[PDB]
Design a protein around this motif. Sequence first.
Motif, PDB file in Angstrom:
ATOM      1  N   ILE A   1      10.782  -0.675  -7.170  1.00  0.00           N
ATOM      2  CA  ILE A   1      10.207  -1.262  -5.912  1.00  0.00           C
ATOM      3  C   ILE A   1       9.598  -2.488  -6.089  1.00  0.00           C
ATOM      4  O   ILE A   1       8.396  -2.286  -6.634  1.00  0.00           O
ATOM      5  N   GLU A   2       9.504  -3.502  -5.547  1.00  0.00           N
ATOM      6  CA  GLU A   2       9.013  -4.704  -5.921  1.00  0.00           C
ATOM      7  C   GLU A   2       7.916  -4.956  -4.636  1.00  0.00           C
ATOM      8  O   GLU A   2       8.446  -5.061  -3.575  1.00  0.00           O
ATOM      9  N   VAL A   3       6.713  -5.040  -4.849  1.00  0.00           N
ATOM     10  CA  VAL A   3       5.566  -5.150  -3.703  1.00  0.00           C
ATOM     11  C   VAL A   3       5.050  -6.706  -4.079  1.00  0.00           C
ATOM     12  O   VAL A   3       4.445  -7.251  -4.733  1.00  0.00           O
ATOM     13  N   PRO A   4       5.349  -7.449  -2.886  1.00  0.00           N
ATOM     14  CA  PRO A   4       4.670  -8.798  -2.904  1.00  0.00           C
ATOM     15  C   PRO A   4       3.196  -8.591  -2.748  1.00  0.00           C
ATOM     16  O   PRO A   4       2.563  -7.787  -2.614  1.00  0.00           O
ATOM     17  N   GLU A   5       2.554 -10.160  -2.839  1.00  0.00           N
ATOM     18  CA  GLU A   5       1.212 -10.040  -2.988  1.00  0.00           C
ATOM     19  C   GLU A   5       0.404  -9.825  -1.847  1.00  0.00           C
ATOM     20  O   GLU A   5      -0.720  -9.011  -1.988  1.00  0.00           O
ATOM     21  N   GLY A   6       0.997  -9.862  -0.331  1.00  0.00           N
ATOM     22  CA  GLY A   6       0.096  -9.632   0.840  1.00  0.00           C
ATOM     23  C   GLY A   6       0.438  -8.243   1.376  1.00  0.00           C
ATOM     24  O   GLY A   6       0.105  -8.047   2.332  1.00  0.00           O
ATOM     25  N   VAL A   7       1.296  -7.504   0.689  1.00  0.00           N
ATOM     26  CA  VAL A   7       1.785  -6.032   1.095  1.00  0.00           C
ATOM     27  C   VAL A   7       0.925  -5.102   0.301  1.00  0.00           C
ATOM     28  O   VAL A   7       0.776  -5.037  -0.807  1.00  0.00           O
ATOM     29  N   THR A   8       0.384  -4.032   1.037  1.00  0.00           N
ATOM     30  CA  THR A   8      -0.324  -2.813   0.289  1.00  0.00           C
ATOM     31  C   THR A   8       0.596  -1.597   0.791  1.00  0.00           C
ATOM     32  O   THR A   8       1.010  -1.310   2.079  1.00  0.00           O
ATOM     33  N   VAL A   9       0.883  -0.749  -0.198  1.00  0.00           N
ATOM     34  CA  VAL A   9       1.710   0.418   0.086  1.00  0.00           C
ATOM     35  C   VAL A   9       1.048   1.760  -0.167  1.00  0.00           C
ATOM     36  O   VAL A   9       0.399   1.644  -1.308  1.00  0.00           O
ATOM     37  N   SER A  10       0.846   2.634   0.616  1.00  0.00           N
ATOM     38  CA  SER A  10       0.231   4.082   0.305  1.00  0.00           C
ATOM     39  C   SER A  10       1.133   4.864   0.498  1.00  0.00           C
ATOM     40  O   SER A  10       1.865   5.352   1.758  1.00  0.00           O
ATOM     41  N   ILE A  11       1.384   5.913  -0.521  1.00  0.00           N
ATOM     42  CA  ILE A  11       2.517   6.791  -0.511  1.00  0.00           C
ATOM     43  C   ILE A  11       1.498   8.224  -0.987  1.00  0.00           C
ATOM     44  O   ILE A  11       1.158   8.127  -2.158  1.00  0.00           O
ATOM     45  N   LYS A  12       1.675   9.164   0.067  1.00  0.00           N
ATOM     46  CA  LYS A  12       1.189  10.584  -0.526  1.00  0.00           C
ATOM     47  C   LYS A  12       1.870  11.582   0.213  1.00  0.00           C
ATOM     48  O   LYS A  12       2.207  11.468   1.332  1.00  0.00           O
ATOM     49  N   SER A  13       2.539  12.540  -0.619  1.00  0.00           N
ATOM     50  CA  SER A  13       3.337  13.546  -0.183  1.00  0.00           C
ATOM     51  C   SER A  13       4.520  13.248   0.468  1.00  0.00           C
ATOM     52  O   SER A  13       4.953  13.665   1.606  1.00  0.00           O
ATOM     53  N   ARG A  14       5.267  12.361   0.063  1.00  0.00           N
ATOM     54  CA  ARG A  14       6.314  11.504   0.624  1.00  0.00           C
ATOM     55  C   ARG A  14       6.128  10.891   2.046  1.00  0.00           C
ATOM     56  O   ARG A  14       7.126  10.820   2.705  1.00  0.00           O
ATOM     57  N   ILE A  15       4.746  10.710   2.315  1.00  0.00           N
ATOM     58  CA  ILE A  15       4.429   9.892   3.429  1.00  0.00           C
ATOM     59  C   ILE A  15       4.172   8.561   2.941  1.00  0.00           C
ATOM     60  O   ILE A  15       3.460   8.146   2.548  1.00  0.00           O
ATOM     61  N   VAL A  16       5.049   7.572   3.324  1.00  0.00           N
ATOM     62  CA  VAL A  16       4.813   5.945   3.108  1.00  0.00           C
ATOM     63  C   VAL A  16       4.388   5.236   4.193  1.00  0.00           C
ATOM     64  O   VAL A  16       4.824   5.398   5.471  1.00  0.00           O
ATOM     65  N   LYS A  17       3.355   4.465   3.707  1.00  0.00           N
ATOM     66  CA  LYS A  17       2.667   3.392   4.826  1.00  0.00           C
ATOM     67  C   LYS A  17       2.455   2.287   4.000  1.00  0.00           C
ATOM     68  O   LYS A  17       2.132   2.053   3.078  1.00  0.00           O
ATOM     69  N   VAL A  18       3.197   1.247   4.757  1.00  0.00           N
ATOM     70  CA  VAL A  18       2.937  -0.250   4.090  1.00  0.00           C
ATOM     71  C   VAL A  18       2.322  -1.126   5.298  1.00  0.00           C
ATOM     72  O   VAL A  18       2.354  -0.776   6.491  1.00  0.00           O
ATOM     73  N   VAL A  19       1.319  -2.021   4.856  1.00  0.00           N
ATOM     74  CA  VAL A  19       0.743  -2.777   5.529  1.00  0.00           C
ATOM     75  C   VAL A  19       0.835  -4.491   5.139  1.00  0.00           C
ATOM     76  O   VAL A  19       0.858  -4.820   4.109  1.00  0.00           O
ATOM     77  N   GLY A  20       1.178  -5.164   6.122  1.00  0.00           N
ATOM     78  CA  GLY A  20       1.613  -6.408   5.766  1.00  0.00           C
ATOM     79  C   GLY A  20       0.987  -7.455   6.818  1.00  0.00           C
ATOM     80  O   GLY A  20       0.253  -7.164   7.778  1.00  0.00           O
ATOM     81  N   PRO A  21       1.370  -8.841   6.687  1.00  0.00           N
ATOM     82  CA  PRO A  21       0.624  -9.844   7.711  1.00  0.00           C
ATOM     83  C   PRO A  21       1.187  -9.596   9.289  1.00  0.00           C
ATOM     84  O   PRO A  21       0.580  -9.750   9.996  1.00  0.00           O
ATOM     85  N   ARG A  22       2.687  -8.926   9.327  1.00  0.00           N
ATOM     86  CA  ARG A  22       3.045  -8.893  10.422  1.00  0.00           C
ATOM     87  C   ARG A  22       2.832  -7.555  11.090  1.00  0.00           C
ATOM     88  O   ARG A  22       3.090  -7.516  12.285  1.00  0.00           O
ATOM     89  N   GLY A  23       2.185  -6.680  10.418  1.00  0.00           N
ATOM     90  CA  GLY A  23       1.975  -5.335  10.920  1.00  0.00           C
ATOM     91  C   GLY A  23       2.126  -4.308   9.907  1.00  0.00           C
ATOM     92  O   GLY A  23       1.963  -4.408   8.724  1.00  0.00           O
TER      93      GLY A  23
END
Lengths: 129, 188, 49
Positions: free
Chosen positions: B10-32
């Motif tokens: 999985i490729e993560v761009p510069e402005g995106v932050t991904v937090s995964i724990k216990s199969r709960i995935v959260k992504v944060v980006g410029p659009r929301g």
Amino acid sequence: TKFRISLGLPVGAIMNCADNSGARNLYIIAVKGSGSRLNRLPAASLGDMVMATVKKGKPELRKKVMPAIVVRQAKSWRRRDGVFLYFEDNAGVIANPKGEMKGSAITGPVGKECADLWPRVASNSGVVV
Amino acid sequence: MKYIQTEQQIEVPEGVTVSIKSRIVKVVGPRGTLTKNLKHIDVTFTKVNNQLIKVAVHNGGRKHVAALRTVKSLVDNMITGVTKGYKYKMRYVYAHFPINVNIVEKDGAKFIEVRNFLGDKKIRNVPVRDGVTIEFSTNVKDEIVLSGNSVEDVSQNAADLQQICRVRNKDIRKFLDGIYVSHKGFIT
Amino acid sequence: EPSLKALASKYNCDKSVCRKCYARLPPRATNCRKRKCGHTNQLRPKKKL
RNA sequence: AGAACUGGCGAUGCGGGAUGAACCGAACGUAGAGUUAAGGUGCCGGAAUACACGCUCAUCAGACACCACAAAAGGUGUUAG
RNA sequence: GCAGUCAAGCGUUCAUAGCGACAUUGCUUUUUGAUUCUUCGAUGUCGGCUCUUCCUAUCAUACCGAAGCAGAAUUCGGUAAGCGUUGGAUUGUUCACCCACUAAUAGGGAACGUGAGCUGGGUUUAGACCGUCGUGAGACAGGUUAGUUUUACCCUACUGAU
Ligand SMILES: [Cl-]
Ligand SMILES: [Mg+2]
Ligand SMILES: [Mg+2]
Ligand SMILES: [Mg+2]
Ligand SMILES: [Mg+2]
Ligand SMILES: [Mg+2]
Ligand SMILES: [Mg+2]
Ligand SMILES: [Mg+2]
Ligand SMILES: [Mg+2]
Ligand SMILES: [Mg+2]
Ligand SMILES: [Mg+2]
Ligand SMILES: [Mg+2]
Ligand SMILES: [Mg+2]
Ligand SMILES: [Zn+2]
């Protein structure tokens, strides 16, 4: 449409013929728009279209099935204004399935409910109740 | 045949932050931001660096391995949703009766109303899901545009609008009247 | 409307029909998705108007 | 329905097949101890929710001889060749 | 009786919209046979009437798929027994055939449901008549007419009541 009227003419009833088509009486064999129930006889009231055969009349009018419309009823019925009324006898006129009368004149009074449903009966009738 | 190990990247761009724990995935980006629950696949997420994430299956069969690629696709759609967005375009198709589509507010619920479909007196109302914005594009005749961050929310909302305009008791080959999706793409 | 008619055609006309259960299927499918016919491979194109 | 060879039931209980004249095991004086047969050991139920390698997920799974049924024809379901 | 497989052909062209030969695999026990296990110190027998419930191989109604589906009408198929499926002339009839209405007038089971529930027209005691057969007494799954339908206070079930 017609508000419900008490039924007084089951299958087999013979009513007088009120128009000048040449027939003298009508023998009811079926009622249009009737339901189904075990052992229950189909019955007709004022304003109903029925299937009838002429028992006494001109020979060319007998021994065949034709539609008819009841215009008078001897069984008392209640109008929505609260009055119970009835006629002196039972009578009907010969009409085609579309509702146009075979004759051109009606003898005796005609119930108001029948006149409203059938424009052709109203035109050929003299007194409405 | 119980493959020993399978992996996807999985490729993560510069402005995106991904937090995964216990199969709960959260992504944060410029659009929301977007979230997803994945406690039904039994996979393992590992982080290589800030730009790459690997998801793996150990000792999995044919059916289990097939779901590993699905998980990669879902997370990828989340990432591109918050950095580029999704844009679905639909066109009104009719032969005789014009189709009138408007946005109405019923008790603060933000419905979309369809009028005069095949000359029907019935009023057709479709709810608008959260996060989906609807605008009628200009300089194009009979077009409606749906935008959002979630591809599932946008695609399902557009699907509801298409299914609500189905012809009944007629030869649908001849009566080609309805609202159909005409383009799938990105906001940017 | 040649452009809009083609757009509606792909949803209502460009389909495949299962020989056994009459199900509506994608144009390039090789097997039916229904369990009633056991995912049979006997498919035909939907007849044109 | 009618014959051939042998073993049975009838004339026969007992353990097993939930239940059954004929199947399986085994034939019987009154008792004690030990070991087994056929059949079983999640609970009813006495006895390992034992060990080992695989296969199967069925919106009508499957589960043990006699025996209390299923076929032709099909499936990019999955497995091996 | 009902349902499949194969596809030579029919379908203006086009095997499989809808049909389908030559062959071949099944299912059902509402047909009729085959058999003779149970009952001859007896399980009341045809039909109708009445009344309840069950089966789906669905006639109608709800929602759908398919067409040689423009519309209207109709045909094929799916999920479905929830809800309905009638009034009469002739016949003892089940069956059958017509008339008419109707959204529709679908097919079946329950000891070929149901006689201490009825009815007794039919069949199937004894009376009598005809035809054919027999020397005769008499025979005829040929026709005709007249012919006794018994008992519940017990147990259970059910309906109500202490
Ligand atoms: Cl004799
Ligand atoms: Mg003896
Ligand atoms: Mg047994
Ligand atoms: Mg124990
Ligand atoms: Mg014998
Ligand atoms: Mg006795
Ligand atoms: Mg008796
Ligand atoms: Mg008895
Ligand atoms: Mg009986
Ligand atoms: Mg009796
Ligand atoms: Mg009785
Ligand atoms: Mg009698
Ligand atoms: Mg006699
Ligand atoms: Zn199919």
